[PDB]
């Protein structure tokens, strides 16, 4: 072991390095304390002919352009043309780069942490919603098994069906089970007065989904803008829409946060919406029958003082060709006039009274 | 007694030599920290532009902020890059010149940077041995192949999206056809991809409106630049689409689209090969039988065959079993594939 | 769908055993409309991979025992695009055409050794005009027929076809990507040049020979032999400078083959190009590329 006795000197040199890094590593806090302004960064690779070529183009907020090479600490997500970077007083170095995404009108579209309703509020849809509950639970907790089996979850799910079916509140009810950040988005929000806004809205959605933590982005009324016209505004929605499809077709690192979509009608079905990353999950959600409407109305009305003498035959007969949110409006209306009816217990005539009241 | 002390001392020396790797690896990064701290000392540089040069040693610079200045020549650099018309960089002290600044489009970096890695994709396309038509029979993979060779070399990333010919304003897209195709004629190597051409492939059977007439007019420029007065011997275009029925039979002339490649899974060896490259990272039981999956599958989509096989792997993960037998593959690829035949209208 | 022509194919091969060529003339209207119909792209591929074997199988039966070959060469020589003139929608297949021409040159290859000297000159003079009339091919069979005819012209004593083979070779080498066949067929450029000895033709063709090729994507084994067969005729036409860039690249030849015979040729010509090297610049640096080799001092000419 006489040859291995020189390792002690090496360990003393290494622990001496750990003892001497406290000062030069300690000045990091006083030199990198606070970047006082914000400057935009534009990446431009240079060539010196070590003597290697590496530079970048800087733009300050006060419209002043300067010169500086790519410097700072170890960069992994950096080197992108972004803003909100660290800079000292006048030397103009890059110390702390953080993405900005400002235009809060699109950033703070729907800031929802988590909803209140859950998946246990409906009745008679487990045979078709269980695939979605799996498709949102197993891709969140079973990422470890995705390498043993080589499975990549789909990013486009088509939640299509007739309107008024409560698909929005049901997908949100599953978003409560996702436990991630819920972010709504409306179809008619892409159509703006100025040009090129849809690119900023789409790249903003993938800026918060790509940049931010694992979240949930549910959109609705996509059929209202998914028109395949052959000037025209829906062709501009073909520029923004086909741009989004290009970001769901040309991006292999799109294994991040999913994009859930729902269409209230399948009359104008875009044929280009068929792909593993695109809207491949096509589970048909028809109009619930009087049995299913009595189920979702019973579980949605399990909190009010409902009379126990309900055979569901009269309401099952009156509810003809109705939808989910319509029976939800009947439940809410019954909870509205049942107060002024004097009797605190919900009666049986209030069902047809609400049906003929709002419809 | 003596023979055991050599192995024991070899074990003490082993656990003594196995602790250096836990420090000597991160000491390189710790020293790299001070290397960067010594690399951030070159600060205080500004930019400028050269318009007119009077003296060969000292010339006039034009700063971005608006005020103009005059600088000298540094003893290190030479008169090669000192010629006018090249954007350079300056210093706040003495207005010396460290190096130049090559111009680029703010957008030219985006148009010349998007790149896709992966070299095995060229050999992962399955058993598949001046224009190419990628039409849409019951089989997909039009993007995995173009992005497979495009991911291999492609010599560029000149992707042409069918949504870039919108032209919300007056339909003068001829400036973009001649501009981008003029870039194709300028750069000696060029590969053009035209994905989802069915949207801009209107058959103009009836009287088209102003929105259709401008797109068909861009198709008239395509005619004038494919069979007009301009050859395309060196440039190549890849017309990808979805339905091989409305593909502009005026454009379906064999003068442009030499060959037709029906992207499908006809051959049993192609379906078996694509099934084996998609069945790589999946683990299964010892009972393996691919001839039933390949035999029962008739005229399906490749990437959607991956979605149906992985859909059977999730049908098998519903019962949270680590091993996946091929019974759920035959019955789940069977039933789910029959649902794809139901939704194949 | 090819299901209609498949029964006519496998039934036609059974019914067509002893019948003469008149039944083929009765088959002409049966196959004309059969080729006009079938707009399907991938389905009729079998119909064209069977019917052509029925008509060429009947050609085999007709050419089996007795052959006049006049009516045979008149049928195809006069009927090429008769089915392609009524169909305005060209299916741009280019899938069975390579099997068509390859099967025709295969049957002509089985009938090309010794059958009858009369029809071979008209068949070959027909197919070399079909080379010009084609204008779209992989450029394999088009070179095959003219080089297998040129080999006969070598012993025939008629070297007038040199302008034909070497004029058509430029067309048969541009427009496609050929790595192996281009080197195997490129020797015809300097093959008949010993009989032609045209200096301007040598100036056109090592110029068109060494365009883009250094080492890779071209293996035979005999590569170094053709390397010696390339610029030696430019040494015949040139005087001294032709071998200055030729004898400097044969240093890898002893590494590929046995070094026993390299002393007489490689280590002999290792000094001639540096002796004939220009006195301005190449003599100064080119003398260091050969210096240091242990085999150099073993030569008695090392003192020279």
Curated annotation (Swiss-Prot), chain A:
PTM comment text: Sumoylated by UBE2I in response to MEKK1-mediated stimuli.
Amino-acid positions noted as binding ATP in the UniProt annotation, renumbered to this chain: 161-168
Residue numbers bearing the Phosphoserine modification: 307
Disease: Deafness, cataract, impaired intellectual development, and polyneuropathy: An autosomal recessive disease characterized by early onset of deafness, cataract, severe developmental delay, and severely impaired intellectual development. Patients later develop polyneuropathy of the lower extremities, associated with depigmentation of the hair in that area.
Subunit structure as annotated in this protein's UniProt entry: Component of the 19S proteasome regulatory particle complex. The 26S proteasome consists of a 20S core particle (CP) and two 19S regulatory subunits (RP). The regulatory particle is made of a lid composed of 9 subunits, a base containing 6 ATPases including PSMC3 and few additional components. Interacts with PAAF1. (Microbial infection) Interacts with HIV-1 Tat.
Compartments reported by the entry: Cytoplasm; Nucleus
Statement: the UniProt record of this protein carries the keyword Transit peptide: no
Name this polypeptide is given: 26S proteasome regulatory subunit 6A
Superkingdom as given in the UniProt entry: Eukaryota
Molecular function GO labels: ATP binding; ATP hydrolysis activity; identical protein binding; proteasome-activating activity
Purpose of the protein: Component of the 26S proteasome, a multiprotein complex involved in the ATP-dependent degradation of ubiquitinated proteins. This complex plays a key role in the maintenance of protein homeostasis by removing misfolded or damaged proteins, which could impair cellular functions, and by removing proteins whose functions are no longer required. Therefore, the proteasome participates in numerous cellular processes, including cell cycle progression, apoptosis, or DNA damage repair.
InterPro entries: 26S_Proteasome_ATPase, AAA+_ATPase, AAA_lid_3, ATPase_AAA_core, ATPase_AAA_CS, NA-bd_OB-fold, P-loop_NTPase, Prot_ATP_ID_OB_2nd
GO biological process, one term: proteasome-mediated ubiquitin-dependent protein catabolic process
Family from the record: Belongs to the AAA ATPase family.
Entry annotated with the keyword Ubl conjugation: yes
Curated annotation (Swiss-Prot), chain B:
General function of this protein: Component of the 26S proteasome, a multiprotein complex involved in the ATP-dependent degradation of ubiquitinated proteins. This complex plays a key role in the maintenance of protein homeostasis by removing misfolded or damaged proteins, which could impair cellular functions, and by removing proteins whose functions are no longer required. Therefore, the proteasome participates in numerous cellular processes, including cell cycle progression, apoptosis, or DNA damage repair.
Source organism superkingdom: Eukaryota
Positions of transmembrane segments: none
Family: Belongs to the AAA ATPase family.
Species of provenance: Homo sapiens
Record's subunit section: Component of the 19S proteasome regulatory particle complex. The 26S proteasome consists of a 20S core particle (CP) and two 19S regulatory subunits (RP). The regulatory particle is made of a lid composed of 9 subunits, a base containing 6 ATPases including PSMC6 and few additional components. Interacts with PAAF1.
Protein known as: 26S proteasome regulatory subunit 10B
Main location group: cytoplasm
Sequence positions bearing N6-acetyllysine: 62, 168
PANTHER family for this protein: 26S PROTEASOME REGULATORY SUBUNIT
SUPFAM superfamilies reported in the protein's UniProt record: P-loop containing nucleoside triphosphate hydrolases (SSF52540)
Chain sites annotated for binding ATP: 136-143
Keyword vocabulary terms for this entry: Acetylation, ATP-binding, Cytoplasm, Nucleotide-binding, Nucleus, Phosphoprotein, Proteasome
A cellular component term, taken from the record's GO annotations: proteasome accessory complex
Modified residues (Phosphoserine): 206
Swiss-Prot record, chain C:
Superkingdom of the source species: Eukaryota
GO cellular-component term (any): secretory granule lumen
Signal peptide positions on this chain: none
Membrane spanning stretches: none
Record key words, sorted: Acetylation, Intellectual disability, Isopeptide bond, Proteasome, Ubl conjugation
Residues carrying N-acetylalanine: 2
Cross-link (Glycyl lysine isopeptide (Lys-Gly) (interchain with G-Cter in SUMO1)): 92
One Gene Ontology biological process: proteasome-mediated ubiquitin-dependent protein catabolic process
Residue positions, PTM N6-acetyllysine: 221
Glycyl lysine isopeptide (Lys-Gly) (interchain with G-Cter in SUMO2) cross-link, chain position(s): 92
Family to which this protein belongs: Belongs to the proteasome subunit p55 family.
Disease: Stankiewicz-Isidor syndrome: A neurodevelopmental disorder characterized by delayed psychomotor development, intellectual disability, behavioral disorders, mild dysmorphism, ophthalmologic anomalies, feeding difficulties, deafness, and variable congenital malformations of the cardiac and/or urogenital systems.
Protein role: Component of the 26S proteasome, a multiprotein complex involved in the ATP-dependent degradation of ubiquitinated proteins. This complex plays a key role in the maintenance of protein homeostasis by removing misfolded or damaged proteins, which could impair cellular functions, and by removing proteins whose functions are no longer required. Therefore, the proteasome participates in numerous cellular processes, including cell cycle progression, apoptosis, or DNA damage repair.
Subunit structure and binding partners: Component of the 19S proteasome regulatory particle complex. The 26S proteasome consists of a 20S core particle (CP) and two 19S regulatory subunits (RP). The regulatory particle is made of a lid composed of 9 subunits including PSMD12, a base containing 6 ATPases and few additional components. Interacts with ERCC6.
Name of this protein: 26S proteasome non-ATPase regulatory subunit 12
Native source species: Homo sapiens (Human)
């Amino acid at each position: 072991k006489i040859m291995k006795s020189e390792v002690l000197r090496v360990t003393h040199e290494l622990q001496a390095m750990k003892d001497k890094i406290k000062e030069n590593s300690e000045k990091i806090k006083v030199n990198k304390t606070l970047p006082y302004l914000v400057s935009n960064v534009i990446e431009l690779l240079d060539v010196d002919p070590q003597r290697k070529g590496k530079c970048a183009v800087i733009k300050t907020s006060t419209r002043q352009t300067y010169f500086l090479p790519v410097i700072g600490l170890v960069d992994a997500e950096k080197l992108k043309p972004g803003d909100l970077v660290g800079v000292n007083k006048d030397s103009y170095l890059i110390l702390e780069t953080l993405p900005t995404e400002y235009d809060s009108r699109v950033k703070a579209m729907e800031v929802d942490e988590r909803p209140t309703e859950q998946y246990s509020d409906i009745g008679g849809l487990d045979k078709q919603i269980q695939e979605l509950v799996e498709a949102i639970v197993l891709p969140m907790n079973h990422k470890e098994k995705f390498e043993n089996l080589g499975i990549q979850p789909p990013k486009g799910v088509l939640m299509y069906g007739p309107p008024g079916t409560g698909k929005t509140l049901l997908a949100r009810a599953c978003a409560a089970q996702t436990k991630a950040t819920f972010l709504k988005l409306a179809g008619p929000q892409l159509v703006q007065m100025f040009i090129g806004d849809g690119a900023k809205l789409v790249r903003d959605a993938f800026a918060l989904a790509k940049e931010k933590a694992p979240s949930i982005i549910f959109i609705d009324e996509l059929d209202a803008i998914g028109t395949k016209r052959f000037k025209a505004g829906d062709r501009e929605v073909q520029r923004t829409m086909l741009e989004l499809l290009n970001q769901l077709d040309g991006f292999q690192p799109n294994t991040q946060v999913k994009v859930i979509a729902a269409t209230n009608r399948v009359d104008i079905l875009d044929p280009a919406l068929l792909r593993s990353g695109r809207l491949d999950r096509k589970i048909e959600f028809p109009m619930p029958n009087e049995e299913a409407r009595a189920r979702i109305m019973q579980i949605h009305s399990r909190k009010m003082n409902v009379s126990p003498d309900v055979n569901y035959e009269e309401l099952a007969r009156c509810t003809d060709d109705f939808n989910g949110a319509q029976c939800k409006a009947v439940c809410v209306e019954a909870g509205m006039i049942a107060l002024r009816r004097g009797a605190t217990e919900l009666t049986h005539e209030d069902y047809m009274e609400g049906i003929l009241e709002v419809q | 007694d003596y023979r055991k002390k050599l192995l024991e001392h070899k074990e003490i020396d082993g656990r003594l030599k196995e602790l250096r790797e836990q420090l000597k690896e991160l000491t390189k990064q710790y020293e790299k920290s001070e290397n960067d701290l010594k690399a951030l000392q070159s600060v205080g540089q500004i930019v400028g532009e050269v318009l007119k040069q009077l003296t060969e040693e000292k010339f006039i610079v034009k700063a971005t902020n608006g005020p103009r200045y005059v600088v000298g020549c540094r003893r290190q650099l030479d008169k090669s890059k000192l010629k006018p018309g090249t954007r350079v960089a300056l210093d706040m002290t003495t207005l010396t010149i460290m190096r130049y600044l090559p111009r680029e489009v703010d957008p030219l970096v985006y148009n010349m940077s998007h790149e896709d890695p992966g070299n095995v994709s060229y050999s992962e396309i399955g058993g598949l041995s001046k224009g190419c038509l990628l039409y849409g029979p019951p089989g997909t993979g039009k993007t995995l192949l173009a992005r497979a060779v495009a991911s291999q070399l492609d010599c560029n990333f000149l992707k042409v999206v069918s949504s870039s010919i919108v032209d919300k304003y007056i339909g003068e897209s001829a400036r973009l056809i001649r501009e981008m195709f003029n870039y194709a004629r300028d750069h000696q190597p060029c590969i053009i991809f035209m994905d989802e051409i069915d949207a801009i492939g209107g058959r103009r059977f009836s009287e088209g409106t102003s929105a259709d007439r401008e797109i068909q007019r861009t198709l008239m420029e395509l005619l004038n630049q494919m069979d007009g007065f301009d050859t395309l011997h060196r440039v190549k275009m890849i017309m990808a689409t979805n339905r091989p029925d409305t593909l502009d039979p005026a454009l379906l002339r064999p003068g442009r689209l030499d060959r037709k490649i029906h992207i499908d899974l006809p051959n049993e060896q192609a379906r078996l090969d694509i099934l084996k490259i998609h069945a790589g990272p999946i683990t299964k039981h010892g009972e393996i039988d691919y001839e039933a999956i390949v035999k029962l599958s008739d005229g399906f989509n490749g990437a959607d065959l991956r979605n149906v096989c992985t859909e059977a792997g999730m049908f098998a993960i519903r019962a949270d079993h680590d091993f996946v037998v091929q019974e759920d593959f035959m019955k789940a690829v069977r039933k789910v594939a029959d649902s794809k035949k139901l939704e194949s209208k | 769908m090819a299901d209609g022509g498949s029964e006519r194919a496998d039934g036609r091969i059974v019914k067509m055993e002893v019948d003469y060529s008149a039944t083929v003339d009765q088959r002409l209207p049966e196959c004309a409309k059969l080729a006009k119909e079938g707009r399907l792209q991938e389905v009729i591929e079998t119909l064209l991979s069977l019917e052509k074997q029925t008509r060429t199988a009947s050609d085999m039966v007709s050419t089996s025992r007795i052959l006049v070959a006049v009516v045979k060469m008149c049928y195809e020589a006069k009927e090429w695009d008769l089915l392609n003139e009524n169909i305005m929608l060209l299916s741009k297949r280019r899938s069975q055409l390579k099997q068509a021409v390859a099967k025709m040159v295969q049957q002509c290859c089985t009938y090309v050794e010794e059958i009858t000297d009369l029809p071979i000159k008209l068949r070959l003079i027909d197919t070399l005009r079909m080379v010009t009339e084609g204008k779209i091919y992989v450029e394999i069979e088009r070179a095959r027929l003219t080089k297998t005819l040129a080999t006969i012209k070598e012993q025939n004593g008629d070297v007038k076809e040199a302008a034909s083979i070497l004029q058509e070779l430029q067309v048969e080498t541009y427009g496609s990507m050929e790595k192996k066949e281009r080197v195997e067929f490129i020797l015809e450029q300097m093959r008949l040049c010993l009989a032609v000895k045209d200096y301007i033709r040598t100036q056109i063709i090592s110029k068109k020979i060494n365009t883009k090729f250094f080492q890779e994507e071209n293996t035979e084994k005999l590569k170094l032999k053709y390397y010696n067969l390339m610029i030696q005729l430019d040494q015949h036409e040139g005087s001294y400078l032709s071998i200055c860039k030729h004898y400097r690249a044969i240093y890898d030849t002893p590494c590929i083959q046995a070094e026993s015979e390299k002393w007489q040729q490689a280590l002999k010509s290792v000094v001639l190009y540096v002796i004939l090297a220009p006195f301005d610049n190449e003599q100064s640096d080119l003398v260091h590329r050969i210096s240091g080799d242990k085999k150099l001092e073993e030569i008695p000419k090392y003192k020279d």
